Structure 1
Amino acid sequence: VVGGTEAQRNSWPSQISLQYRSGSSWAHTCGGTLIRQNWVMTAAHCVDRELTFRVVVGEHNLNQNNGTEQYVGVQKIVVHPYWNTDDVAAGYDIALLRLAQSVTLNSYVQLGVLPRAGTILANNSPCYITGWGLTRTNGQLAQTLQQAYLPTVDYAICSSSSYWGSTVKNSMVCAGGDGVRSGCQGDSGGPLHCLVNGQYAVHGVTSFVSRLGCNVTRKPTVFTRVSAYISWINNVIASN
C-alpha cells in the first residue's frame, strides 16, 4: 500500500497473508480474505505459480511474533474456470482456497462480510485498502499491515478514456487514482473494505495497478468485484 498508515491490530480481522515456501523459509506474496473458517478468497493470479502456499491469519507484523497468528496449509485451490493468466484485463481474477484446517475465530481472526449479489457502490464511496504490499512503486513490502482510504471511481468514469478505458470491465471495481495512495505489488488478492449501512463489507479483491506505477493519477487500483461472483463462491463452497 502506497500512502498508507499502520492499521491497529484488531481493525481488519479478515485480512490474511498468503505465503509461499522459499527453501526453508516462507515469504508473503499476496493478501486474501477469510470467508469461512476453512476458506480464503484471493486473486487467481496469486496462485498461478506451482508453489507451496500457506495462510497466516491474526497476522500483523510479517517479521516478528505478534502472539495472535495461526498458520494453516492449503488443501485445495479453486481458480475461476475463466481465468486467463495472459489477460488480467479480461477479468475473473479470483480464487478460493480451502484450508487444511479450520482456524479459530477470535478478535484478531474473523470472517469477512461479503456484499449481496449485484450490489454496485455509488461513485466515490468510502473504502479502505489493506495489505503488506510495496510501500512505494518498485519499493519493498511493508513489515506491518497498512491501510489507506481509497474512494471508489464508478464504472462509467473508470472505463472512460482519461482513466482506464477499455482495460477495465464491469466485473471490476476501481478505487483510488489520486496519485498519492494506492494498492501495489504484494497487496493483490487482499480486501477492499467499504462501509455500507454502517457495516464494512469486502467489495473488491485487489487485482492490478498500472504498468507505470502503483500510485498514478487517474489510474485507480483495480479490483475484482466480489458482488459479481457470489453465486460462483457459494457454489464452490457448497461442493468442496
Structure 2
Amino acid sequence: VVGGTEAQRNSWPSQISLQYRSGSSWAHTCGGTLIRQNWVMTAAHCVDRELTFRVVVGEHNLNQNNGTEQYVGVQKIVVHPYWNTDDVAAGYDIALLRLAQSVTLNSYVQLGVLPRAGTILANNSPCYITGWGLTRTNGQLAQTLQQAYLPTVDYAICSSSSYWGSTVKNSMVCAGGDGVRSGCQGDSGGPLHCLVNGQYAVHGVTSFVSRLGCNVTRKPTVFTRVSAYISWINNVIASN
C-alpha cells in the first residue's frame, strides 16, 4: 500500500498473508480474506504458479513474532474456471483456498463479512485497503500491516476514457486514484473493506494497478467485485 499508515494491532482480523516456500524460508506474496474457519478468498493470479503455499492469520509484523499468529497449510486451490492468466483485464481474478486445518477464531482472527450478491456501491463510497504490499512503486514490502483510505470510483467514471477506459469491466470495483494512495504489488488478493450500513464488508479482492506505477492519478486500483461472485463462492464451499 502506497501512501498508507500502520494499521492498529490486529484491527482488520480477517486479513491474511499468503506466503510461499523459498528454499528453506517463507516469503509473503499476496493478501487474502478469511471467509470461513477453513476457507480463504484471494486473487487467482496469486496462485497461478505451482508453489507451496501457507496462510498466516492474526499477523501484523511479518518479520517478528507478535504472539497472535496461526500458521496453516493450503490443502486445495479452487480458481474461478474462467480465469485467464494472460488476460487479467478479462476479470475472474478470484480463487478460494481450503486450508489443511481450521484456524481458531479469537480477538485477532475473525471472519470477513461478504456483501449481498449484486450489491454496487455509490461513487466515492468510504473504503480502506489493507496489505503488506510495496509502500512505493518498485519499492519494498511493508513489515507491518498498512491501511489507506481509498474511496470508490463508480463504473461509469472508471470505465470512461479519462480513467481506465474499456480495460475495466462491471465485474470490477475501482478505488483511489488521488495519485498519492493505492494498492501495489504484494497487496494483491487482499480485501477492500467498505462501510455499508454501519458495518465493514469486503467488497473487493485487490487485482491490479497500472503498469506505469501503483499510485498514478486517474488510475485507481482495480478490484474483483466480490458481490458478483457470491453464488460461485457459496457453491464452492458447499461442494468441497
Deviation at 1:107, TM superposition (A): 1.1
Deviation at 1:135, TM superposition (A): 0.2
Q: CA–CA distance in 1 between the matches of 2:89 and 2:232?
A: 20
What is the TM-score with the length of structure 1 in the denominator?
Answer: 1.00
Q: CA–CA distance in 1 between the matches of 2:201 and 2:162?
A: 29
Q: Is the 8 A contact 2:83 2:93 kept in 1?
A: yes
Q: Is the 8 A contact 2:10 2:60 kept in 1?
A: no
How far does the alpha carbon of each residue in 1:15-39 deviate from its partner, in whole angstroms, 9 at most, with x for none? Answer: 0000000000000000000000000
Q: CA–CA distance in 1 between the matches of 2:221 and 2:158?
A: 10
Deviation at 1:10, TM superposition (A): 2.6
Provide the secondary structure at the position in 2 that maps to 1:157.
Answer: helix
Q: CA–CA distance in 2 between the matches of 1:36 and 1:9?
A: 22
Deviation at 1:178, TM superposition (A): 0.3
Q: Residues 64-83 of structure 1: matches in 2 within 5 Å?
A: 64-83=64-83
Deviation at 1:226, TM superposition (A): 0.1
Deviation at 1:175, TM superposition (A): 0.2
How far does the alpha carbon of each residue in 1:119-166 deviate from its partner, in whole angstroms, 9 at most, with x for none? Answer: 000000000000000000000000000000000000000000010000
Provide the secondary structure at the position in 2 that maps to 1:236.
Answer: helix
Deviation at 1:220, TM superposition (A): 0.1
Equivalent pairs: percent with the same residue?
A: 100
Q: Residues 177-216 of structure 1: matches in 2 within 5 Å?
A: 177-216=177-216
Provide the secondary structure at the position in 2 that maps to 1:35.
Answer: strand
Q: CA–CA distance in 2 between the matches of 1:115 and 1:149?
A: 19
Q: CA–CA distance in 2 between the matches of 1:210 and 1:200?
A: 27
Please list every run of at least 4 consecutive aligned residues from structure 1 whose deviation after the TM superposition is greater than 4 angstroms.
Answer: none
Unaligned runs of 5+ in 2: none
How far does the alpha carbon of each residue in 1:184-210 deviate from its partner, in whole angstroms, 9 at most, with x for none? Answer: 000000000000000000000000000
Unaligned runs of 5+ in 1: none
Deviation at 1:99, TM superposition (A): 0.1
Number of equivalent positions: 240
Q: Residues 57-96 of structure 1: matches in 2 within 5 Å?
A: 57-96=57-96
Q: CA–CA distance in 1 between the matches of 2:125 and 2:208?
A: 20
Provide the secondary structure at the position in 2 that maps to 1:62.
Answer: coil
Q: CA–CA distance in 2 between the matches of 1:127 and 1:162?
A: 22
Matched, 1:24 2:24: yes
Deviation at 1:11, TM superposition (A): 1.2
What is the TM-score with the length of structure 2 in the denominator?
Answer: 1.00
Q: CA–CA distance in 1 between the matches of 2:9 and 2:194?
A: 19
Q: CA–CA distance in 1 between the matches of 2:108 and 2:169?
A: 34
